[PDB]
């Protein structure tokens, strides 16, 4: 699964 | 929405850089600075994040000793400090908001980079 | 580290031809749970910073001409210029964000037959 912690900037939630 | 680099430079070899990303047109607090290496030869290279707004940090393990990032946000500045400086840290140095996706904005700005220059 | 694998490191193409840059990943960066690819491509004229042109593998940024496209999903991605003009000469990076550290390509150099 994806680190959302890699680019805080992203934002995963559509 | 844009950021601006301070100018090239020239350092002795086991010194330190501090390179500051100065940025506008935008709510600083709200987001991560990224900066990105890029050297002759080689591929860009993620150095670590700074988030404007509480000051945490995530650096890569290829600089996790050896730089630190900063920010000041009076000045909506973001610093990179790269310590003992060894030659082949000659690079281009970027300060970037990479890839910002939020459920209403989406916008990916660089700096225009610093040369610096490792060298007696 | 996600390695990025870019072919051909560097393709020349007539004006107006159509130009197409594969980018593959080390690891799967599909999340099922969302459906999205966390990969972006950018492109770097000389001595300017990288720009922007697509991310989540497909979405073009606001701005960016509709003759570039992303494609592909998973492991496997597609950057295609449908018509090149002279000023799409320039290297192509595609990019992860996926997993920590972030990661680039190698980069695909465009080059104009003239």
């Known amino acids: 699964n994806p680190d959302p912690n890699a680019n805080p900037n992203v934002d995963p939630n559509a | 929405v844009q950021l601006v680099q301070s100018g090239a430079e020239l350092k002795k070899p086991g010194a330190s850089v501090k390179v500051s990303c100065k940025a506008s047109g935008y709510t600083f607090t709200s987001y991560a600075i990224h900066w990105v290496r890029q050297a002759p030869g080689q591929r860009l290279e993620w150095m670590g994040w700074?988030?404007?707004?509480?000051?945490?940090?995530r650096y890569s393990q290829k600089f996790q000793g050896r730089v630190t990032i900063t920010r000041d946000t009076s000045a909506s500045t973001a610093y990179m400090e790269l310590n003992s400086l060894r030659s082949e840290d000659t690079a281009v140095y970027y300060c970037?908001?990479?890839?910002?996706?939020?459920?209403?904005?989406?916008?990916?700005?660089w700096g225009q980079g610093t040369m610096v220059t490792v060298s007696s | 580290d996600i390695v990025m694998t870019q072919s051909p490191d560097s393709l020349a193409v007539s004006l107006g031809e159509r130009a197409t840059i594969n980018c593959k990943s080390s690891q799967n960066i599909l999340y099922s749970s969302n459906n999205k690819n966390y990969l972006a491509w950018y492109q770097q004229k000389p001595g300017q910073p990288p720009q922007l042109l697509i991310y989540?593998?497909?979405t073009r940024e606001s701005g960016v001409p509709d003759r570039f496209s992303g494609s592909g999903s998973g492991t496997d991605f597609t950057l295609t210029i449908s018509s090149l003009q002279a000023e799409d000469v320039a290297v192509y990076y595609c990019?992860?964000?996926?997993?920590?550290?972030?990661?680039f390509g190698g980069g695909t150099k465009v080059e104009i037959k003239r």
């Open positions: 990019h992860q964000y996926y997993s920590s550290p972030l990661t």
């Open positions: 989540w593998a497909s």
């Open positions: 700074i988030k404007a707004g509480n000051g945490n940090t």
């Open positions: 970037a908001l990479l890839t910002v996706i939020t459920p209403d904005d989406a916008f990916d700005i």
